[PDB]
Amino acid sequence: SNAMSYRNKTYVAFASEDIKFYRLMEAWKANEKIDFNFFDAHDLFISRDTSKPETIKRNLRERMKNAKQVVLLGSGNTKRKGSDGVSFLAHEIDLIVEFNLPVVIANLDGDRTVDKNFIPKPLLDSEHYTVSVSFQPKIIKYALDNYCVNYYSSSNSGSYLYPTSVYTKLGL
Ligand SMILES: [Br-]
Ligand SMILES: [Br-]
Ligand SMILES: [Br-]
């Protein structure tokens, strides 16, 4: 219950408006359409009515210290909330930048390119190396297995995509 699997390395961050897409991701795990585990902090968001903001902030920092990599669900709500300096997602994004974690942006409209209008401004301003992929299980896992593993050794900076051959070879 409080013990965490070593294989559960991936934190998923999203704007509260986009919870439907996260639930879809949770369906994929329960129905084994995905081949990776992940965790999140939506429980802390839910408990905001019974918790003071300073308590939520400390609990969130604590939660994110266990992440090795991030899947960021990308939409216009991601950019707005993630750039506004006050929202729950804005605090997540600040920690994600501070902890220098790799980020896979999964574009919720299926865009297989970089859409900077889905990426929060602090993450763009950090110039950290990121990759943007469609919101599809197999490309997300490919990014976790490749980009995220290579993040620290790479000399690249800023926003990348995966070329069409990667999607083709995955049967997408
Ligand atoms: Br776990
Ligand atoms: Br939010
Ligand atoms: Br496309």
Numbering used by the authors: -2 to 169
Which text from the study accompanies this structure?
The Thoeris defense system triggers abortive infection (Abi) upon phage detection. The ThsB genes encode Toll/interleukin-1 receptor (TIR) domain–containing proteins responsible for phage detection, while the ThsA gene encodes an Abi-triggering effector protein. Two ThsA effector variants have been reported: a silent information regulator (SIR2) and SMF/DprA-LOG (SLOG) domain–containing effector (ThsASIR2-SLOG) and a transmembrane (TM) and macro domain–containing effector protein (ThsATM-macro). Collectively, our biochemical and structural data demonstrate that the nucleotide signaling requirements for ThsASIR2-SLOG and ThsATM-macro effectors are distinct and suggest that ThsATM-macro effectors can trigger Abi via membrane perturbation by a mechanism that involves nucleotide-induced oligomerization of its macro domain.
